[PDB]
Design a protein around this ligand. Structure first.
Ligand SMILES: Nc1ccn([C@@H]2O[C@H](COP(=O)(O)OP(=O)(O)OP(=O)(O)O)[C@@H](O)[C@H]2O)c(=O)n1
Ligand SMILES: [Mg+2]
Lengths: 245, 241
């Protein structure tokens, strides 16, 4: 059971042009993610999937493996599918190039879940959040059943707070583990109405009846999207370097 | 493949005490529902499950079959579980006693669905509604997949309208078709967090991993909960004559 980690990293960004190359305690953001992916036990290879040569070069500079992909990919899953045809593996894990504070143990939880159930097509992560945070459409909520299988993903607060005291919210952490066969049949999947309405690609899978199991982890670190969150990550990343005893 | 229709009809109601016995164009509400259930092809028996002697007598007065059930049930589903032990069938259909405008063809669509797929445990109905009607917490929304299997039921507008013109909404019509084995294992199912927060009993089923297929029909008539709805249904059923 070979597993590889693919880190999609595209340069072009509106509010942060060249986001993966941003400096954080003296290292390009893309390098922090790569260094952490390497600490995940059970993974044979780690690749960075990009559509820009400036990113491919920055990756080669620190000795990381980069593979150029097409710029016409409408999603990070389409990019993983292209990488899949060239890089062989039974399990592909998709890590976000913009989340430098990822915990290697969290990825291992995901990988172990995939290995403990050969029939599981896709696996993802989630963590508890308060009702106030669930109110934000920018946050993706997930409701699961007893087997921790996702029932639905939405920007609307689910479950609805009819009896508010009983409601417990889960935030979806955008890291996925895909079985090789799911990626082979992916491009043949049609876009669903819920996917297009919510603008959540993972719903394309649910539309086709593909099961997505969601594992719960602790509150993850803040992702880099806005400069206000960047300073916190730089200070949080810095506070982390001088922390041991 | 034997199928029976059970109509849970308790006497009590917070706004309309004695609801099933309320007169509508000359007949108690329960009679309208019973008469329509009899028009559904492929059904072997129609039963009215009640907790009150007054309702039982009224049913027998018009030629209907009635069964006395316990008064300690909090749901019309638990009332159906009690009936399942007394009335043997492969498929049980649960019709609401307060929806006299039910179309017999809509129940046939549901029954046909159960018969076309022996593996299907539960089936229910739905119809399209506007984005406006969907914003209401009192209306239950459902989102389905390609096989029309329900992904989730919520009072929240789902799918969330990020791209408004792409969003299409479905209202859940509260009629169910249950396979016998589902009802036999019902009392063993634990209440779920989503069920308790949303106050939607069908979520107890989804939490257990039981598939619920949703069939789409045309917009349905209103039920009778409040005295305002009762006058509207009376007006409607009158002009339908
Ligand atoms: N404990 C209960 C609750 C409801 N029902 C039945 O379920 C059907 C409609 O559902 P419901 O909306 O729950 O009826 P209500 O009594 O109005 O309950 P609620 O106020 O929660 O809506 C009716 O035929 C009613 O008799 C029942 O048999 N036993
Ligand atoms: Mg009531």
């Amino acid at each position: 059971s070979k597993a590889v980690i693919v880190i999609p990293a595209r340069y072009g960004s509106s509010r942060l042009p060249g986001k993966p190359l941003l400096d954080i305690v003296g290292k390009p953001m893309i390098q922090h993610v790569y260094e952490r992916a390497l600490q995940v036990a059970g993974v044979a290879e780690v690749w960075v999937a990009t559509d820009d040569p400036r990113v491919e070069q920055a990756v080669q500079a620190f000795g990381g493996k980069a593979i150029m992909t097409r710029n016409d990919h409408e999603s990070g899953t389409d990019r993983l599918v292209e990488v899949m045809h060239k890089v062989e593996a039974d399990i592909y894990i998709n890590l976000q190039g913009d989340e430098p504070m990822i915990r290697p143990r969290d990825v291992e939880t995901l990988l172990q879940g995939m290995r403990d159930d050969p029939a599981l097509p896709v696996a993802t992560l989630c963590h508890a959040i308060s009702a106030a945070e669930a109110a934000e459409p920018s946050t993706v909520k997930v409701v699961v059943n007893t087997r921790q299988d996702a029932l639905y993903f939405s920007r609307s607060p689910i479950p609805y707070p009819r009896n508010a005291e009983k409601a417990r919210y889960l935030k979806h952490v955008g890291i996925y583990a895909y079985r090789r066969d799911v990626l082979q049949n992916y491009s043949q999947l049609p876009e669903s109405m819920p996917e297009q309405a919510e603008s959540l690609e993972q719903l394309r899978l649910m539309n086709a009846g593909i099961n997505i199991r969601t594992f719960e982890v602790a509150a993850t670190g803040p992702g880099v999207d806005t400069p206000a969150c960047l300073e916190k990550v730089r200070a949080l990343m810095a506070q982390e370097l001088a922390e041991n005893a």
